[PDB]
């Protein structure tokens, strides 16, 4: 007798957890301000997440971003040949960049003055400089050191403790003098969006309109980027939450299912163990009150106006898909305020999340019911 | 004995409901005036639903539609900095557009003069103006307000209650004066179709020929849009309705199936419980008479001329696909009048829909039979 | 005992029906003269069915076909506004075309002088004229009437019974005068194929070489259309006929299968009930004799030369696919005459079809056997 | 007892037949000289089978091949109209071509002087001339006769027995005089491959390098066709043969499988019936001797050097795929000689095929064993 | 009882072998230095394996590589005709190349002076020269000999023992004199990458930056090749190793599973036979200490900081995928040192590989346990 009650309690808890997970998935409001963008050219790339003013942008990519890469002035026999003094036990390589707070220091050992060793140490630094070796032809090799993109990453190199390695790797970017040689010079990205000039370090421009991120593969002219509203994710989330509510109420009805029996007959095992439970009735009444919104500033106060209606017998909400789509498309802000609102007290999603959290909160009605049952 | 009769009644009701659903799906008549269109270029897009004169249109997209977007004249330190007086408790922002009946008013609070707050309020208005923030570079920000497409949506902005915010957001489009600056100027879409000039607000042109909707991604010249008649949807609907009628008559024959038995033997359960019933015979006779169309203006006076013939033993219709396709292709209006007609009195589909609805209507022969049986 | 005989007779009848159906599918000889075509450009489209001289055609599409479409000289307030006298009870619209035997007459009612009503009536005519409405802008509407393609479809319009509608819709194409206005003027399609000029009405040219149908989407110059022989359909049909014969012979062998048993044992049910039957032996002997052709003018007299040989024990044909492909590719007309010939007495497919039909014909040996068994 | 022995003999024979089939599939050596080609342009097409010198060919398609097609000088009313004398019972049409050994003769009947009849007869000739009918417009028709590609197929036509048909179809290509008229003039294909000029009749060039076949869809300039070595087919065949040998030895071990039993116990039915058989041991010893190649001129004497090693317990070969690929890629000729060689006495595949055919041939060890068993 | 213990030992050994295989698969460290490259043009092809400096390279393909191919000066009747003296029993063909250590010698027999025989012998030599036959037209043939790509493979040919074959095949590349003729002249590949000129023999350039391999299909200008860091392989390997450890711990817990039973009851079969085993506890403690690694120079001293945490009850690791991705993306060298390090003494993967190898090493704790059990 009590085992069936405990099993019903566990099933109800599992269903409530699933419904809470679905509602939490619905909670985030970035889906309502969802846009989709496209461009005429295949060079420019566009990505929009939220907060994008739907419209048309004439995006001109007047420039791309180049890193800085430097190379030695001397070719060598191979990689393993020594490029510095072997009598010196240790030495330091110092690289100064305007965009870093403190200079970069690399410690080099006694016999590790081979281009392979220098390259491995510098690539192990992992602070915006990367090393490579260039094989021009047979019996020729060069060392190449590269920065990241932007004029804030031009670099000035010096060596302390050694003199030959300082005769090799010393470069001064501020004075444009050094023992290395410049391969690739650093530049900034520059574009024009709807009459506003935008400058960036890299080629991933993110706040020309705040909310739209561009990618500059090639220089383009008068490329049209069109951004439109979108709610397919919004409607999919709405239907997912509706189906989760349907599953939850179906589980509640099954746990509260009662089968008519003849007088004097034995109790059927098909009967739900949650018949006449105060917690179930309280939770269902709270959710039903959540259905008819109060305190919202939206024009539509209920999804009955939106088009979602709950059948009494089945307990499953049925969606008027076309009318819901019309409501979402015509007035986005009204639906968003109805479901989200300020996010603290108003908004159907917000209030339902708060109510379900309170129901599942510690020392709540569920915890008290469990304590009473286990007592 | 009576339980079998009730089961047969329920099965007949379900079969008739399915047939009525299929017939109602068939009832929609725009499928006969179905066309399909295509263009030479991939810039112009075309969509045709109904009422399109099949032919060739030389469509020149001489212009596209631009919205209006405005921006402030001052750059600021960040978003959260205040842009208006803090001693003022509340204020009003008024936007006047020719295409709206009443002006747009936005209420701004005391400490909410930050570009984020203004942007959120204006995007919450949801009346054809959208707000965004532009990050030119580090320690630079702009506010951008955008309209919709068309010269009917140019806007004039003023502020009541505050003076700094009025020194910021006030624009006058009629006089081309203001405190903001124009980024994108509004224009109308203009195209030429078969020698007729068409002007629109947006870039979705819908009534150049009434029934064909164009989409203007790029300016195109002498693009050929060819529109041809189509009946694949029509023939698919015809086959679907015929197969639904086949299923209906198969269910009827099963419910009226009589198996030969030796005299004096018990009643077989395989025998349909609907044997010798007036309702079934009356409905079948009515449908059969509906097949023999009367009063239609079409040249073909019967659906048998089309090519679909009903087998006597099975009762399920078989379609001569080639002859039906020939009839549909050669004379579309004749077939449409034969099946649809004026939509009130004549037409095979219209007569059949009316008859089946009357059979399934409340207080009809089926409801009377149910009342008699349940009594 | 006799039940097994009847079952075997029915199985043989079904197998013979299937073989006859497959042979009838094989009978048609258009597959032997099968070609496949292609073009260099994607504007021109090509379709070849039969009787096409394989080769190369330099096809120049010097012109396309334009229909004729006319429009009114006056714009109106809307569709529902009346266009003619309301006191007149009925009136007639007459359209004369050179390509039609009798003029087109449309009857218009008393209060049905709205552009919607005229448009619906003319589209209901369904005689090569279609009606549409054009919305230039707000509070502007036009009526447009369109013909089909070709100079044989230019039309002359008049109205009898009414004077205002005659002031609206009257056009004279012969004199180029009227109350309507010309939008699209009619032209003929003109192309050049292998030095021969071809003229057509529409843009579907079908007899430049008799057997090849072109489609003219855009004007093209020196497009090369290459047409080659093809027998993949012929090969697949040959395989299908061979497999059908294999199935038929397997069914015959099963119905004539005899299982060795010890003397004095009972008759096995595995034994075919068609053992020692005159009709079955006669049919099999006829098929075996017609396997090798007599009276054919082809160099090869049997498919044993071609490569298809019947196994002794199983009786199912096995195909030497490589040798059959070689025979088909090297000599097409020889194999065609060998299978088809004149189509009356010679040709293996034709005379086999005749023999099988005579076997299955009414009052034939099969029907006589059925009558004798049922007697 | 003997039934199990016969079943084991049959299973061994089936396994040996399958292994022999796999070895015969492996036998052909064209897989070792396998190349793959590609081109820069999509006009030129390339196909390589064997014997192709891997490298780069600059192929210039300076010309394509045109057939010859002729047409009559008179247009007619239709096809069924007679084009020749009806009093003449029969007549001859003679076509002479330089590329044919004997002239082409067509016999025409009394009333068969219709363009349809002439066309059908000439298409029935099937000797490089094909007939077609051209419908210029209404009440106009032409007859067109076409050759194949190459200047060796220009044709000269005359008629014996009739005068009108000779006034119609007589053409002289040598003197460029006739009653027909030329539509398409015959030309030869000309291309340049790696500085060598190649001339052909058709547009399928096959021996510019002997082993590479080109296809000339359009005139191309400086198209680079690169041909590289390939062994994916070779390695796949090697794996297939190795797995076939694995299956064969697995079957042998199953038929020679022995299970240990306790003293005094009954013989296990899981034991193979081929335990201690002279034929099996002899065949396996011969195969293992073939594994250790002798007389080969290759640097490698065994696939153990290549990477394929035979496990003792399972008896199935295990392949070092990486090492086998290395061996195949580095030295193709060495592996080819090791497996194939001259194809008569040396080569592992050759010797294995000879040994297996000798084992499975009539009067062989298996046939002798079966004869002894039947004795 | 002991059979269950042996089965548990075998299961533990199999699970540990699988975990060792997975950890050895993870042991390879070049996955951490994984990059992905792309180009703007479709001609140039790019591949990257490891050690690639992420950035942008402007690659100009100023030249491609051509092999050398030579041909005879005389055309012949066919292939089988003899091209040399028949009285000479044997002769030698000598080819000298700068890029080979010793000259190439081909031995030719008495009657084997046919172009087919010479071609087959030279293609059988397989030392960078390949032979082909060219059919210019009917009754014309040429022999063509081709080298490989690069000026180091120009070849000089002479014949010893014969005078006619030496009159045919003798070429001198150094002096540009000979009896053959040059078809294709040899050249070197030349490109420019980020201001560094690169020269190669073939068209597969591999060390312009050491780590990026280019393929030069066509001459390209200012092609941008962008190379970015990548860790999808890294994260997939990490997750695969984590799941392998999870499965290993699940197997361990199954072999150490203990089920609570009533006192005096029989031992459950579900209880693992490895309960209270020193080897299992030692291995698990060692591996758990390996996660809590010491001596690593990485900023994160524990893998738990990355985001992968082991549940006590289940023993299977749960991965914080987002935090793992952030850790890998932000600091690649730190994670690499944490897992790999120098590869000898530090690095979690290195420590775990050493520990598991020692556990599974011969004469180890597992081998000693097996020896004790089998004793």
PDB file of N, CA and C in Angstrom, chain C residues 63-96:
ATOM      1  N   UNK C  63      15.896  33.196 -82.285  1.00  0.00           N
ATOM      2  CA  UNK C  63      14.724  33.911 -81.797  1.00  0.00           C
ATOM      3  C   UNK C  63      13.944  33.007 -80.855  1.00  0.00           C
ATOM      4  N   UNK C  64      13.162  33.634 -79.985  1.00  0.00           N
ATOM      5  CA  UNK C  64      12.216  32.948 -79.119  1.00  0.00           C
ATOM      6  C   UNK C  64      10.807  33.422 -79.447  1.00  0.00           C
ATOM      7  N   UNK C  65       9.824  32.761 -78.850  1.00  0.00           N
ATOM      8  CA  UNK C  65       8.424  33.020 -79.148  1.00  0.00           C
ATOM      9  C   UNK C  65       7.799  33.867 -78.051  1.00  0.00           C
ATOM     10  N   UNK C  66       7.171  34.969 -78.450  1.00  0.00           N
ATOM     11  CA  UNK C  66       6.477  35.864 -77.540  1.00  0.00           C
ATOM     12  C   UNK C  66       4.978  35.799 -77.793  1.00  0.00           C
ATOM     13  N   UNK C  67       4.202  35.743 -76.715  1.00  0.00           N
ATOM     14  CA  UNK C  67       2.756  35.836 -76.814  1.00  0.00           C
ATOM     15  C   UNK C  67       2.350  37.291 -77.026  1.00  0.00           C
ATOM     16  N   UNK C  68       1.045  37.534 -77.104  1.00  0.00           N
ATOM     17  CA  UNK C  68       0.510  38.885 -77.158  1.00  0.00           C
ATOM     18  C   UNK C  68      -0.310  39.134 -75.904  1.00  0.00           C
ATOM     19  N   UNK C  69      -0.050  40.259 -75.245  1.00  0.00           N
ATOM     20  CA  UNK C  69      -0.829  40.663 -74.085  1.00  0.00           C
ATOM     21  C   UNK C  69      -1.161  42.138 -74.219  1.00  0.00           C
ATOM     22  N   UNK C  70      -2.410  42.469 -73.903  1.00  0.00           N
ATOM     23  CA  UNK C  70      -3.013  43.780 -74.064  1.00  0.00           C
ATOM     24  C   UNK C  70      -3.494  44.271 -72.707  1.00  0.00           C
ATOM     25  N   UNK C  71      -3.633  45.587 -72.575  1.00  0.00           N
ATOM     26  CA  UNK C  71      -4.089  46.182 -71.328  1.00  0.00           C
ATOM     27  C   UNK C  71      -4.966  47.388 -71.626  1.00  0.00           C
ATOM     28  N   UNK C  72      -5.800  47.743 -70.650  1.00  0.00           N
ATOM     29  CA  UNK C  72      -6.701  48.873 -70.806  1.00  0.00           C
ATOM     30  C   UNK C  72      -5.928  50.187 -70.791  1.00  0.00           C
ATOM     31  N   UNK C  73      -6.582  51.237 -71.282  1.00  0.00           N
ATOM     32  CA  UNK C  73      -5.986  52.564 -71.301  1.00  0.00           C
ATOM     33  C   UNK C  73      -6.320  53.384 -70.064  1.00  0.00           C
ATOM     34  N   UNK C  74      -7.217  52.895 -69.213  1.00  0.00           N
ATOM     35  CA  UNK C  74      -7.665  53.624 -68.037  1.00  0.00           C
ATOM     36  C   UNK C  74      -7.403  52.817 -66.773  1.00  0.00           C
ATOM     37  N   UNK C  75      -6.895  53.493 -65.749  1.00  0.00           N
ATOM     38  CA  UNK C  75      -6.782  52.930 -64.414  1.00  0.00           C
ATOM     39  C   UNK C  75      -8.022  53.297 -63.612  1.00  0.00           C
ATOM     40  N   UNK C  76      -8.409  52.417 -62.694  1.00  0.00           N
ATOM     41  CA  UNK C  76      -9.653  52.597 -61.962  1.00  0.00           C
ATOM     42  C   UNK C  76      -9.391  52.552 -60.462  1.00  0.00           C
ATOM     43  N   UNK C  77     -10.464  52.755 -59.693  1.00  0.00           N
ATOM     44  CA  UNK C  77     -10.337  52.860 -58.243  1.00  0.00           C
ATOM     45  C   UNK C  77     -10.055  51.505 -57.608  1.00  0.00           C
ATOM     46  N   UNK C  78     -10.778  50.473 -58.025  1.00  0.00           N
ATOM     47  CA  UNK C  78     -10.614  49.145 -57.447  1.00  0.00           C
ATOM     48  C   UNK C  78     -11.180  48.117 -58.421  1.00  0.00           C
ATOM     49  N   UNK C  79     -11.225  46.858 -57.981  1.00  0.00           N
ATOM     50  CA  UNK C  79     -11.720  45.775 -58.822  1.00  0.00           C
ATOM     51  C   UNK C  79     -13.242  45.761 -58.902  1.00  0.00           C
ATOM     52  N   UNK C  80     -13.924  46.028 -57.788  1.00  0.00           N
ATOM     53  CA  UNK C  80     -15.371  45.855 -57.718  1.00  0.00           C
ATOM     54  C   UNK C  80     -16.152  46.974 -58.394  1.00  0.00           C
ATOM     55  N   UNK C  81     -15.500  48.071 -58.768  1.00  0.00           N
ATOM     56  CA  UNK C  81     -16.188  49.152 -59.462  1.00  0.00           C
ATOM     57  C   UNK C  81     -16.663  48.690 -60.837  1.00  0.00           C
ATOM     58  N   UNK C  82     -17.876  49.103 -61.200  1.00  0.00           N
ATOM     59  CA  UNK C  82     -18.490  48.663 -62.446  1.00  0.00           C
ATOM     60  C   UNK C  82     -17.829  49.327 -63.646  1.00  0.00           C
ATOM     61  N   UNK C  83     -17.660  48.553 -64.718  1.00  0.00           N
ATOM     62  CA  UNK C  83     -16.990  49.019 -65.925  1.00  0.00           C
ATOM     63  C   UNK C  83     -17.948  49.264 -67.081  1.00  0.00           C
ATOM     64  N   UNK C  84     -19.234  48.950 -66.920  1.00  0.00           N
ATOM     65  CA  UNK C  84     -20.183  49.071 -68.007  1.00  0.00           C
ATOM     66  C   UNK C  84     -21.564  49.416 -67.492  1.00  0.00           C
ATOM     67  N   UNK C  85     -22.502  49.522 -68.431  1.00  0.00           N
ATOM     68  CA  UNK C  85     -23.859  49.934 -68.097  1.00  0.00           C
ATOM     69  C   UNK C  85     -24.538  48.898 -67.209  1.00  0.00           C
ATOM     70  N   UNK C  86     -25.269  49.380 -66.205  1.00  0.00           N
ATOM     71  CA  UNK C  86     -26.021  48.507 -65.314  1.00  0.00           C
ATOM     72  C   UNK C  86     -27.446  48.263 -65.785  1.00  0.00           C
ATOM     73  N   UNK C  87     -27.962  49.096 -66.693  1.00  0.00           N
ATOM     74  CA  UNK C  87     -29.312  48.888 -67.205  1.00  0.00           C
ATOM     75  C   UNK C  87     -29.361  47.758 -68.226  1.00  0.00           C
ATOM     76  N   UNK C  88     -28.223  47.421 -68.832  1.00  0.00           N
ATOM     77  CA  UNK C  88     -28.186  46.355 -69.826  1.00  0.00           C
ATOM     78  C   UNK C  88     -28.168  45.005 -69.119  1.00  0.00           C
ATOM     79  N   UNK C  89     -29.070  44.111 -69.527  1.00  0.00           N
ATOM     80  CA  UNK C  89     -29.198  42.822 -68.856  1.00  0.00           C
ATOM     81  C   UNK C  89     -28.071  41.865 -69.230  1.00  0.00           C
ATOM     82  N   UNK C  90     -27.659  41.856 -70.496  1.00  0.00           N
ATOM     83  CA  UNK C  90     -26.631  40.927 -70.948  1.00  0.00           C
ATOM     84  C   UNK C  90     -25.936  41.508 -72.168  1.00  0.00           C
ATOM     85  N   UNK C  91     -24.738  40.994 -72.439  1.00  0.00           N
ATOM     86  CA  UNK C  91     -23.905  41.515 -73.516  1.00  0.00           C
ATOM     87  C   UNK C  91     -22.917  40.432 -73.923  1.00  0.00           C
ATOM     88  N   UNK C  92     -22.241  40.650 -75.053  1.00  0.00           N
ATOM     89  CA  UNK C  92     -21.348  39.642 -75.606  1.00  0.00           C
ATOM     90  C   UNK C  92     -20.011  40.267 -75.979  1.00  0.00           C
ATOM     91  N   UNK C  93     -18.938  39.521 -75.724  1.00  0.00           N
ATOM     92  CA  UNK C  93     -17.572  39.904 -76.067  1.00  0.00           C
ATOM     93  C   UNK C  93     -17.063  38.901 -77.093  1.00  0.00           C
ATOM     94  N   UNK C  94     -16.581  39.404 -78.229  1.00  0.00           N
ATOM     95  CA  UNK C  94     -16.181  38.584 -79.364  1.00  0.00           C
ATOM     96  C   UNK C  94     -14.695  38.774 -79.632  1.00  0.00           C
ATOM     97  N   UNK C  95     -13.961  37.664 -79.667  1.00  0.00           N
ATOM     98  CA  UNK C  95     -12.523  37.655 -79.916  1.00  0.00           C
ATOM     99  C   UNK C  95     -12.260  36.782 -81.135  1.00  0.00           C
ATOM    100  N   UNK C  96     -11.597  37.352 -82.138  1.00  0.00           N
ATOM    101  CA  UNK C  96     -11.303  36.673 -83.392  1.00  0.00           C
ATOM    102  C   UNK C  96      -9.802  36.458 -83.518  1.00  0.00           C
TER     103      UNK C  96
END
